[PDB]
Amino acid sequence: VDQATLDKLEAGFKKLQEASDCKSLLKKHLTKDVFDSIKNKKTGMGATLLDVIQSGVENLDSGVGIYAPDAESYRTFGPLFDPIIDDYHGGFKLTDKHPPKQWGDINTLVGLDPAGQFIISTRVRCGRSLQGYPFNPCLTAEQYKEMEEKVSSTLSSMEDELKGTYYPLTGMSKATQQQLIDDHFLFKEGDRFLQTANACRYWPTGRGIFHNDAKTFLVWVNEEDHLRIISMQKGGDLKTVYKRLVTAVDNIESKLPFSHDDRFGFLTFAPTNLGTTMRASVHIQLPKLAKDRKVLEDIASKFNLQVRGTRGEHTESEGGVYDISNKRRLGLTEYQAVREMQDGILEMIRMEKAAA
Numbered sequence: 419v420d421q422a423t424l425d426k427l428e429a430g431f432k433k434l435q436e437a438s439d440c441k442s443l444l445k446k447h448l449t450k451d452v453f454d455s456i457k458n459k460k461t462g463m464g465a466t467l468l469d470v471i472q473s474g475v476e477n478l479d480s481g482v483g484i485y486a487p488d489a490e491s492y493r494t495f496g497p498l499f500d501p502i503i504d505d506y507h508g509g510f511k512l513t514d515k516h517p518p519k520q521w522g523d524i525n526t527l528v529g530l531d532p533a534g535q536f537i538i539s540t541r542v543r544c545g546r547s548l549q550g551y552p553f554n555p556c557l558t559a560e561q562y563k564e565m566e567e568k569v570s571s572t573l574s575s576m577e578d579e580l581k582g583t584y585y586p587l588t589g590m591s592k593a594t595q596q597q598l599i600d601d602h603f604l605f606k607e608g609d610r611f612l613q614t615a616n617a618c619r620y621w622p623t624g625r626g627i628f629h630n631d632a633k634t635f636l637v638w639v640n641e642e643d644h645l646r647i648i649s650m651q652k653g654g655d656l657k658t659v660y661k662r663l664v665t666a667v668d669n670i671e672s673k674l675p676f677s678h679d680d681r682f683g684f685l686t687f688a689p690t691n692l693g694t695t696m697r698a699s700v701h702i703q704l705p706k707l708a709k710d711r712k713v714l715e716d717i718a719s720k721f722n723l724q725v726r727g728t729r730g731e732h733t734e735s736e737g738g739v740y741d742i743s744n745k746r747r748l749g750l751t752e753y754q755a756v757r758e759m760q761d762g763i764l765e766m767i768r769m770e771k772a773a774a
C-alpha cells in the first residue's frame with residue numbers, strides 16, 4: 419500500500435468516528451484493532467482496504483458499507499469481512515462453512531395470498547460470478563464487453579418459457595430503459611453506494627438485461643454482480659416463480675462456469691449476497707401493520723425479513739407497497755432461504771388480518 423491511500427484510510431476511519439449517527443455495520447465492526455490490523459494489506463490485483471470500505475465511508479447512511487473488489491479481498495481483509503458477514507447473516511462463525519447448494523422440495527411451497535388483497539407480486543433472484551473474472555472495481559472496459567459476450571451467447575440457447583432476447587444497455591432508448599426500471603424489471607442506473615465502490619466504471623458498456631417476452635424470467639448483466647438470474651410475476655404463486663428460477667439456474671450452470679467458494683458458497687461482489695445469493699421477495703400491502711415503516715421493520719426482523727421501498731433498497735414505500743424479503747443468504751440452503759420469506763409473509767398476513 420502506498421502513502422496517499424493510508425492518508426485517505428486514516429482520514430476515513432476518523433470520519434466514521436465523528437459520525438455519531440452512523441449505524442452502518444462498517445462503523446460497528448471496523449475497530450481500531452481491526453483497522454490497523456489490515457489497512458496495510460493488498461491483493462494480487464492491487465486491491466486495498468480503501469477499495470473495500472470507500473463506499474461506506476463516503477456514504478455514512480450505508481447499512482453495510484463494504485464490497486469485495488476481488489475474491490481474495492474476502493480473505494485478505496477477513497478480520498473486517500468475517501464479523502460483518504456473521505452479524506448480517508444471523509450468525510456465521512469463523513469455522514462455519516456454507517452448505518452445498520440445495521433447492522429443496524419445491525412441492526412444499528404454497529400460495530402466499532389466495533384472496534389477493536395484500537400481495538402485489540412475487541420475485542426471486544440469485545447472483546453468480548463468472549470464473550476468471552474479478553468483481554466490478556477490478557474490471558477493464560474490455561472485460562465488461564467480453565463478459566457481456568459470453569452471457570448473451572449462453573442465453574441465446576434458452577428454450578421454451580426461458581427463451582428471450584438480450585437487450586444491451588448500450589443503444590437502449592431512454593424511454594425503454596426508464597420503463598423497464600419503473601416496471602421493476604431493470605436495475606436502476608447510477609447507485610451512489612456502487613459508484614463510490616467504483617462498481618460502475620465504463621457505464622453503460624457491457625451492461626444489459628435478458629428476458630423472455632413475458633418478462634417473468636430475466637438476467638441482469640454486469641450490474642452489482644456479473645449475473646443476476648431473476649424470476650418474477652404478479653401474484654403470490656411463489657411455487658411457480660421459484661420453480662422457474664431453479665430451472666433457469668440449473669440450465670445456465672451447465673453452460674457457464676460460476677465461482678463457488680468452499681466456505682462462502684457462490685461468491686458475489688457484496689457480502690450480503692454470498693452463499694445462496696438468494697433474495698426472495700414480494701411487493702406487499704399491509705395497511706394495518708405498516709402504520710409506521712419502523713414498526714413494520716421491527717415485526718419483519720423477528721422473521722429474519724428485510725423491508726425495502728417500492729423501487730428497491732434505499733427507497734421509500736409508494737402507496738403502501740413494500741418490498742419484504744428474506745434477509746439472510748449465507749449459512750442456510752436455498753430452500754431454507756425461500757422458506758423464511760414464505761413463512762414470514764404467511765404470518766405477517768395473518769397478523770394483519772387479526773390486527774385491530
Ligand SMILES: Nc1ncnc2c1ncn2[C@@H]1O[C@H](COP(=O)(O)OP(=O)(O)O)[C@@H](O)[C@H]1O
Binds near residue numbers: 539543601700
Ligand atoms: N417482489 C417484487 N415484485 C416486483 N418487483 C420487485 C420485487 N422485488 C424487488 N423488485 C424490484 O427489483 C428491482 C431491484 O431491487 P433491489 O432492491 O436492488 O433488489 P435486488 O438487487 O436484490 O434484485 C427494483 O425494481 C425493485 O422494485
Ligand SMILES: NC(=[NH2+])NCCC[C@H](N)C(=O)O
Binds near residue numbers: 690
Ligand atoms: N445490493 C446490496 N449489496 N445491498 C446491501 C448493501 C448496500 C449498500 N452498500 C449499503 O451498505 O447500504
Ligand SMILES: [Cl-]
Binds near residue numbers: 482
Ligand atoms: Cl452488502
Ligand SMILES: [Mg+2]
Binds near residue numbers: 605642730
Ligand atoms: Mg440491487
